[PDB]
Amino acid sequence: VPQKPKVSLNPPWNRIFKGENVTLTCNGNNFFEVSSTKWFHNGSLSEETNSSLNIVNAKFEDSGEYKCQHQQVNESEPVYLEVFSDWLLLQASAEVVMEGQPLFLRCHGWRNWDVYKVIYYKDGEALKYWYENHNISITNATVEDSGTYYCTGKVWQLDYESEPLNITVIKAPR
Numbered sequence: 001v002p003q004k005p006k007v008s009l010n011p012p013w014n015r016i017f018k019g020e021n022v023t024l025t026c027n028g029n030n031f032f033e034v035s036s037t038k039w040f041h042n043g044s045l046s047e048e049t050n051s052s053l054n055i056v057n058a059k060f061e062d063s064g065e066y067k068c069q070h071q072q073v074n075e076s077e078p079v080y081l082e083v084f085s086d087w088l089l090l091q092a093s094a095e096v097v098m099e100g101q102p103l104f105l106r107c108h109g110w111r112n113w114d115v116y117k118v119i120y121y122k123d124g125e126a127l128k129y130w131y132e133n134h135n136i137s138i139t140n141a142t143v144e145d146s147g148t149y150y151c152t153g154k155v156w157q158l159d160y161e162s163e164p165l166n167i168t169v170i171k172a173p174r
């Protein structure tokens, strides 16, 4: 059944600032041996053949759709990477999560700078409870956790607000 590679990102952040790094890794069931790989940036075949696709000092041109593919197996699901350039970027473990799975939010500051007085807003409303924590970690997700998020934080002496990010947790029917 698990008949297709699952692209994973390290760091998990599929949304990253211009110039940052990220490594795409193509992994699957060692059912059939894999000596090579096929990478696809915006549908075009990359020259990279190692199971790990690296992105150094991400450019905006690096944004897009990434997907790998091994021999004898279907094409991996797509993974969208998007390079930004702003003071605050709201990163997420996954923009879409199956109910029950972990959901991880983060208010990443430009050039890794530390962010103070961080507040997260879910649907224009301020997630007070989370005020204590720097970032938001939710072990077991809920369909109620769905909504448009965005953070607000002081970076190097000035206040800023990140671009909103819609996040949906799906209720699984079987």
Ligand SMILES: *[C@@H]1O[C@H](CO)[C@@H](O[C@@H]2O[C@H](CO)[C@@H](O[C@@H]3O[C@H](CO[C@H]4O[C@H](CO)[C@@H](O)[C@H](O)[C@@H]4O)[C@@H](O)[C@H](O)[C@@H]3O)[C@H](O)[C@H]2NC(C)=O)[C@H](O)[C@H]1NC(C)=O
Pocket (backbone or CB within 6 Å): 041, 042, 060, 061, 062, 063, 064, 065, 081, 082, 083, 085
């Ligand atoms: C792969 O497919 C992707 C589509 O899914 C392509 O992504 C687009 O790539 C272009 C550049 O190649 C990006 O454009 C740049 O955007 C920045 C950011 O602008 C921001 O700020 C202005 C004003 O301050 C605002 O008006 C904008 O809305 C942004 O908030 C500009 O500064 C650059 O000059 C340039 O226009 C696209 O943003 C990007 N789209 C996404 C969704 O990331 C990608 O290029 C494709 N690459 C290949 C190799 O096929």
Ligand SMILES: *[C@@H]1O[C@H](CO)[C@@H](O[C@@H]2O[C@H](CO)[C@@H](O)[C@H](O)[C@H]2NC(C)=O)[C@H](O[C@H]2O[C@H](C)[C@H](O)[C@H](O)[C@H]2O)[C@H]1NC(C)=O
Pocket (backbone or CB within 6 Å): 001, 003, 072, 073, 074
């Ligand atoms: C790709 O994923 C599809 C499902 O969309 C798998 O299709 C099955 O393929 C077999 C013949 O290979 C066919 O008789 C079944 O009816 C298909 N099932 C469905 C639901 O359409 C396919 O996996 C299958 O084929 C490969 C070649 C291995 O033998 C797998 O063990 C087997 O499950 C997937 N293709 C590949 C190349 O993995």
Ligand SMILES: *[C@@H]1O[C@H](CO)[C@@H](O[C@@H]2O[C@H](CO)[C@@H](O)[C@H](O)[C@H]2NC(C)=O)[C@H](O)[C@H]1NC(C)=O
Pocket (backbone or CB within 6 Å): 019, 020, 021, 056, 057
């Ligand atoms: C992204 O990765 C590149 C690759 O290592 C980093 O560039 C290095 O920068 C250091 C300074 O910290 C230099 O000493 C090295 O020579 C650089 N290596 C290369 C290959 O250019 C870059 O700084 C990384 N950026 C982040 C945010 O991780």
Ligand SMILES: *[C@@H]1O[C@H](CO)[C@@H](O)[C@H](O)[C@H]1NC(C)=O
Pocket (backbone or CB within 6 Å): 099, 100, 101, 139, 140
């Ligand atoms: C709650 O989270 C743990 C993982 O730390 C997991 O074992 C458990 O199944 C989760 N609950 C649901 C409904 O998935």
Ligand SMILES: *[C@@H]1O[C@H](CO)[C@@H](O)[C@H](O)[C@H]1NC(C)=O
Pocket (backbone or CB within 6 Å): 148, 166
């Ligand atoms: C963000 O959420 C709003 C309302 O839920 C929706 O209208 C908008 O299309 C979403 N953005 C994207 C890219 O789907």
